[PDB]
Amino acid sequence: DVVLKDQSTTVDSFTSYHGAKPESFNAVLTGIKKPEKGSQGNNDPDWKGFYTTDNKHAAAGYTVSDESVLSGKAGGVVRVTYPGKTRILAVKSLSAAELKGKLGLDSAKPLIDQLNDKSFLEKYGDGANRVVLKMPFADGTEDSEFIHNWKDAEQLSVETEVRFDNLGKRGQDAMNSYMNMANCPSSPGKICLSKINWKNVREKADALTKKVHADKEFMDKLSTHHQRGEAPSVEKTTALHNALLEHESFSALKGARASGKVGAAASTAAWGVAVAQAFTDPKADALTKTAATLSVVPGLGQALGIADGIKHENTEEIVVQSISLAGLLAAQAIPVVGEAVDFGLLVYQLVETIVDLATHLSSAAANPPTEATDSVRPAVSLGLRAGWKTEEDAKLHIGSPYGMKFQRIVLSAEEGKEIPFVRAAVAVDSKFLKINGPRSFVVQNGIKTPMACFETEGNLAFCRPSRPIFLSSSSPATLHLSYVTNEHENGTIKNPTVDILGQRIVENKVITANKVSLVYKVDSSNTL
């Protein structure tokens, strides 16, 4: 009895949501159709289909472009409704081969592509015009996901729920604010952020930092505490922090910063030192590649006190003032080699980059923890911690029914640490093992973030979060890696591991990324 009647329903005018990337939103709005380019929902042919969700906020998080990193460009969410009655069939989390057999399908054709079988429809349809499969394989969310037959999905009426592609590189600002709207009235840990307008934050922080560095009298005194380009220490960076807090423009934040109510001088100073060390990387560029470096420096949230700032009565001002101070501090501390860049343009880029990162962090900080901290055989390194969800997750089955496999890894940090999750390195083999990017995600505090996976095809592949992910004890994350297996004989994996890459390491101009490695067992038994 593979059907789960308690979750299966028959719905009239069935409506669900689908998030589309900038390149695909316009084609999706004009009609749902199997794309010729891409994976068509799954690298496993059995599960190829149109994927929707009952959570329009979760669909909004799948509008981020994965063309670039921190591009700020988003697509939009479509509301898709069927004519007539639809059967949402819930089934057990089993392999497609087993599902095909227990539901009376042909084993030699894809499972989802057969949801419109005449015989299958009569037996399980409950009289409905079609059947849409509720997603068997799990997700960290309390949301429900649906897999549609590609030919059936052509019958959907498509409408715009929300779109961000007309905002250009400010689209993800609106996506972040729209997703957070699930926390707003009509929940002690769930914070509504409606009092923060990201356009206000960017414009006010740009004005505030401009007024400060245009005060030549004040800026010269800032040269006594620290001279731009010289080696910055925690003592120098802390004094530079408090010298900046003395300016009239930071009066709303001075008290709360000095007391620990919003952040701490020691947290911003430690982040400033780490930002200056990270920019000694010859490949880095503070003016033209600001996001690349700031994205891999730990503790940006605590350098802003963002978890504190979003609960303050004067929220927008506190956030503007905390971001402004951190931008001015980083610009004063960043190493100078050769001709120094224009300080005003440097502060502008630093403020812009900080806001690009704070938006995503503020969304995660407004949500209570949802992911387990317990793992099997955790690995730790420089604050970074990764472990297997359960014993069963530390496995890869390349035999028996071939197809979609899953691996769940617990991602966290040591107490007081905030580690960027940059990417995961996984094993692939062009003959029999594929990474399944569209179906890979990371769950943190109820937010589901898609993964963008690329091929080195030296039997290695890299997967990166399409949105910045920072790991802490208070915000543990679960990485859901999806693989696809196909039929082979005598195939093997010489490196059965998963690498977790974090913050940048710098030792005497030499650069690497913080890494932890987990090892799994490869099962080649085609018995089960």
Place this chain on the structure above:
Amino acid sequence: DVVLKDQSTTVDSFTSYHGAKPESFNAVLTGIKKPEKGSQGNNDPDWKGFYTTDNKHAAAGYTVSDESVLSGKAGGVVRVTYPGKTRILAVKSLSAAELKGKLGLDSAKPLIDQLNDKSFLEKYGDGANRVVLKMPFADGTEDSEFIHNWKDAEQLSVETEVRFDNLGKRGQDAMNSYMNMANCPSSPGKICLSKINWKNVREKADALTKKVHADKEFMDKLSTHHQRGEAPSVEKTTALHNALLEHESFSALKGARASGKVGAAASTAAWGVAVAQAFTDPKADALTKTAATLSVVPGLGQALGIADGIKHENTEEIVVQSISLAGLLAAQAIPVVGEAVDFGLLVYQLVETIVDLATHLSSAAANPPTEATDSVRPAVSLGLRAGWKTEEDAKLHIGSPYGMKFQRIVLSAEEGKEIPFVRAAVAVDSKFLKINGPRSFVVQNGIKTPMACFETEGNLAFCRPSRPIFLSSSSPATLHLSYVTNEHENGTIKNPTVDILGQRIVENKVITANKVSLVYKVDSSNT
């Protein structure tokens, strides 16, 4: 067909050499006997026996104490001779179970413990009084090793070849000098170091650094280039290096250092910054735990130009002056937190620690490379590189015939780097997997260094080289990991990996060791 006639011989008054640690040398000298404490040559009962070598210089390298790290204490080498005739039986590198069956021994008893079987003696002895097995499983050296039956070994006459246990913490000075004597008259790259007296180097470097730091006029001028305890930079450290080199006491090295003939100012300056950062570790201590930190900081050899200094005509003076400058430079750059340590005592401890390390490094520098640089699936991290010797090495067989297994890993650095090989973390299981320390070693430039292995018994084990090993492209090393497997049912390995730990990493007072990890395949098949 297991017998190798081309390598088997029949010898009268067969003599070989055995290196004993400080704790065991005196009991070995009075007679050879199976020790009640320890592994008795091998954690595998089949291979338990007395182990000797035909190379007395390699035996000297197995006299170092493994009680402590960089203790400077060594035991000695005994020359052991049998009465009458001995047959050295060379056999193929096979498992003891296969050897026992093919040689007509009982399969239910230890192999080496059966070398005095009457039938075995008659068939394979060639008329000799005993049979001594040449070590089947390999080693990187061109030396020959012999495995003796423990009851047979009681017949050996024991003499002293050389001993170092009367030198206290200076035994390894003489052991290093005695081992290098294999390069001395009676190949361009093999360097004889007979012109260096390590006791002179310590005495002269202590005198030289004292004369400098007792020069208040000169020392005050050194506070302008750098003030003790202040943030060390590469630029500041380089100027500190050149300011020290201007002193009259460094005139014999000033020219060669400035030109690159012996080291380079940038090499000494980079090491000084890294030493200063490493001593920001809250657990480190520059005065009482100097060796602990200096042992895990890359590039000590190039900070001395040791490979150049040992080829110089004025060898001892160049080496004395090179060590003196690095000690004064490091003492000037090391962070000062709280009450500062006495500057003279810090320079003293830094000079002695550098000499404690330079002796081993100079021995490796006097030898041409012998180990391959090509490996299977190398892993790299911050200059550290480790790979499997061959595809067969990336495997562990816990089934089939149980017993002694081997894993060879190629260890090197990236071009221009000198990475300390601190230790290797391996997997063990009290039920079926044991680390086999006595038979684990690392070979670098023809020198065989013993491994000391300890237990976490959380399914992990740590093995460290008993002498400092620094990895470079010009001095590749091969780590020989030895395991023992025993009979088990359903035993499994959750972490089939080997960690290789190198230099210390420093991030905002946070400390870890540079690590590279290799993964092998576990085979439980009963072939």
